[PDB]
Structure formats: C-alpha cells, structure tokens
C-alpha cells in the first residue's frame, strides 16, 4: 500500500504570495497523482489530475509538477478564497491513498474583534438554565482570550469556546464563548461582563449588562 508523505502540515502565506506544497510517494507512481482542495464542511474538489493538468473550472493560478517521486502543487498568487486543506492522492495501485493534508491559513493585517454580549432569553430562563453568550467578530490572528466576570468575580469550568474557520473573503475569524448557569445560580447576581484580550487591542475590552 503506497504511502503519501505531505509537507508541510500547515502554512500561513499572505495574498499575492507563491505558496508550494510537496507530496512524496514511498514507491514509484508515474503521473498517477491528483490534488484536491476541501473547504470547511464542504467535500473535496479536484484541482489537478495526472500531476500537471489543471481540471476544468480551476483558476489558472493553480499548477502541479512531478520531479521523480516528488509532487508539487503551487498557488502562484494566494487569494483569500484559497483557505482550505489540500490533499495529494496517488491512484497507481489500490488502495488509492492520501497525504494527511496541508492547512493553508491566509495571513492579513492584525484586526480588532468587535465584542457583543447577549443575556439569556426569557424563554430559556423559564426552563431553569441560563446561557450567557460573548461574541468576538472578525479579528486576526485566530489567538484570543475571553474571561467571564460575575459581580466582578472571575469564573472557571462553566464556559465553552468555539471559533469559526477563517472567513473566505476577509481572512478573519470570529469566536463564541458561552457561560451557562442554573436560573437559580444566575438570579443571585446582576453584573455580567466578559473580558476579551487580543493583539488588535492595546487594552482588554469588557462588554457587560446588569440582569434587568
């Protein structure tokens, strides 16, 4: 079963950079190699077939190359819409096998999150659980910190983060952080804040509300 060894496993490049990804087959595989791009949630799209040919509907900026057992996909001018994992596959033998794949993150100018905080709904509160949601919108880089302060008392073990894969147009990210509390527990406090720390901020921003 031919192995396919992929380099790198991750890559940040900027818009209008040439980036290049290499794939090394264990045994020989002729021209028997295809290059597919998979976007978040979406299924893989063919980019290159037979190592050097540019599938129909694949923008010219993509290109492929074979030097012996070493295979090279090249993005001549990287575009935000290029964000994806890209996988090399050989089909010379069964099983056709894949590289572990290469995560291409676009690299743009440092961007400050917009923060919004959302009190629990009336209708959840009637079901004896309280969901407080802090949102961070359209920042760069993907690296942040959100802390939760109830009546200025810091919290822990009672919040859960989730980050969007990098937007395709503006190369930015967004983050959701969720504090949960029994209606019982929630009603024993008034000042809900979430502290947010990020590169684009020369000071931590806190959004807050009072229960009322």
């Amino acid at each position: 079963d031919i192995q396919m060894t992929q380099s790198p496993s991750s890559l940040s490049a900027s818009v209008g950079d040439r980036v290049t990804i290499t794939c090394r087959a264990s045994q020989d595989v002729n021209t028997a190699v295809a290059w597919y791009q998979q976007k978040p949630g979406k299924a893989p799209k063919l980019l290159i077939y037979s190592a050097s040919f540019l599938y129909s509907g694949v923008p010219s900026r993509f290109s492929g190359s074979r030097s012996g057992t070493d295979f090279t996909l090249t993005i001549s001018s990287l575009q935000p819409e290029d964000f994806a994992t890209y996988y090399c596959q050989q089909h010379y033998t069964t099983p056709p096998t894949f590289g572990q794949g290469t995560k291409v993150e676009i690299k743009r100018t440092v961007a400050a999150p917009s923060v919004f905080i959302f009190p629990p709904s009336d209708e959840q509160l009637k079901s004896g659980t309280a969901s407080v949601v802090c949102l961070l919108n359209n920042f760069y880089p993907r690296e942040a910190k959100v802390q939760w302060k109830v009546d200025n008392a810091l919290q822990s073990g009672n919040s859960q983060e989730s980050v969007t894969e990098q937007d395709s147009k503006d190369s930015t990210y967004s983050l959701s952080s969720t504090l949960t509390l029994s209606k019982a527990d929630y009603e024993k406090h008034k000042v809900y804040a979430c502290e947010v720390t990020h590169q684009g901020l020369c000071s931590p921003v806190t959004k807050c509300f009072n229960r009322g």
């Binding site: 299924a43 994992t85 056709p96 969007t164 949960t180």
Partner: protein
C-alpha cells in the same frame, strides 16, 4: 453530474447501516464509484470501490469482510452495507466517481453523510434568540443570532430569512457539553439602522429529530 449520499445518521456499536449513493447526469455503468471517509478532524481514508458493469469491488483492510459495496444499475445507485460498526467508523462518508477510461482522478463527490456510532439516544435541539442590544451604538453595526442547544447527534443546518441573508452570518462549529449533548450558535451582524423595520428569522434543521424551527429574533 451529481452524487447524493443518503441513509446515514446515528447507529449502535455492533449495529448495521446501508449508505445510498444516488447518481444523476451520467450512467454509473460507465465508471468506478468510491466511498471515502473523513473521521472528525482527520484526513480522507479511502474505504471501497466497484465497477458497476461487472460488480468487481475492492476494500480497505480496516473495512474488509465487515462492509460490502454494491450497485443497482437501474436506479443509478451504489450502496455500502456497513456491519460490526464501532467508534473507529464514526466519520463522514463521501461517494465519488473515477472520470473516464484513462483519466482515473476523482472529479465528482457527494456532499457527504455523517455516520455517528453511539447507542446514546437522538435528542432534538431547542432554539433561543440572541436579541440585538438596546444600546445599538447609535446606527453602526448590530449583532443578533439563534442559540441552538441540547441536540444529539450532529449535524445542524441554520439559514437566515430563508436563504435571503448570507453576508455577516457566522454559524459557529458546535461544542459538546459535559451532559454528552451538543450546542452551537449562529450570529449575523447588520446595520443597527434596521432592527425594527427588517425581519430576521433563523431556520434550524436537525434531520436526526425531523426538526424545523423558524425563530423570529426580535429586539429586546
């Protein structure tokens, strides 16, 4: 050309499932068909294939003897009988096709179906609005959303004003609560100049619990 995976969801360890791959726009006789699989956060592992004319299949060690690919030439369809299922075979299940006779790249794929292999029960999500701030800067940009909470398994699909509102939409990847249940949110940012006037409604689909909520996120 189209390939449409069906018959994938939740299933007990040990249990059975039969994935359906519906072709249109080309005869499945004239090509090979593949079933490639993506475990959560992992890469593509190829799983099996078949030349619908003869029915000559090939399978991967991990799945040999346990799974069984077949093809109904009449309905233009391919099947994956899956048996002795376990935590290992919990992944997305794509169905693809080799090109012609001498161009053996995989040019067309389904959208994929999530197969989750738990014996935990299916559970239907509640939806709750995330209502735009009163403060509303003065007229710049507002946020608003739907929280979607306590469903099993994945996946959940959220749209907005039924497909009519796409720019500014951030449907977060779901997070697994210690309860063993899922919750995400979806948020859209919009001109604070328009909170009353315009209507914003999130459409929540969870097929696992045949759920269609159309929640109208009002200011407060």
């Amino acid at each position: 050309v189209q390939l449409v995976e069906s018959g994938g969801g939740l299933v007990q360890p040990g249990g059975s499932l039969r994935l359906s791959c519906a072709a249109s726009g080309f005869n499945i006789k004239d090509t090979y068909i593949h079933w490639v699989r993506q475990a959560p956060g992992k890469g593509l592992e190829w799983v099996a294939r078949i030349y619908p004319t003869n029915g000559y299949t090939r399978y991967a060690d991990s799945v040999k003897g346990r799974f069984t690919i077949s093809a109904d030439t009449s309905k233009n369809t391919a099947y994956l009988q899956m048996n002795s299922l376990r935590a290992e075979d919990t992944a997305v299940y794509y169905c693809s096709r080799w090109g012609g006779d001498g161009f053996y790249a995989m040019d067309y794929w389904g959208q994929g179906t999530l197969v989750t292999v738990s014996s935990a029960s299916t559970k239907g999500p509640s939806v709750f609005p995330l209502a735009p701030s009163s403060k509303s800067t003065s007229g710049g940009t507002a946020a608003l959303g739907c929280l979607v909470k306590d469903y099993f398994p994945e996946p959940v699909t959220v749209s907005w004003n039924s497909g009519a509102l796409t720019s500014g939409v951030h449907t977060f990847p779901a997070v697994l609560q210690s309860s063993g249940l899922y919750s995400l949110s979806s948020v859209v940012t919009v001109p604070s100049s328009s909170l009353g006037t315009q209507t914003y409604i999130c459409n929540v689909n969870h097929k696992p619990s045949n759920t269609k909520v159309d929640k109208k996120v009002e200011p407060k």
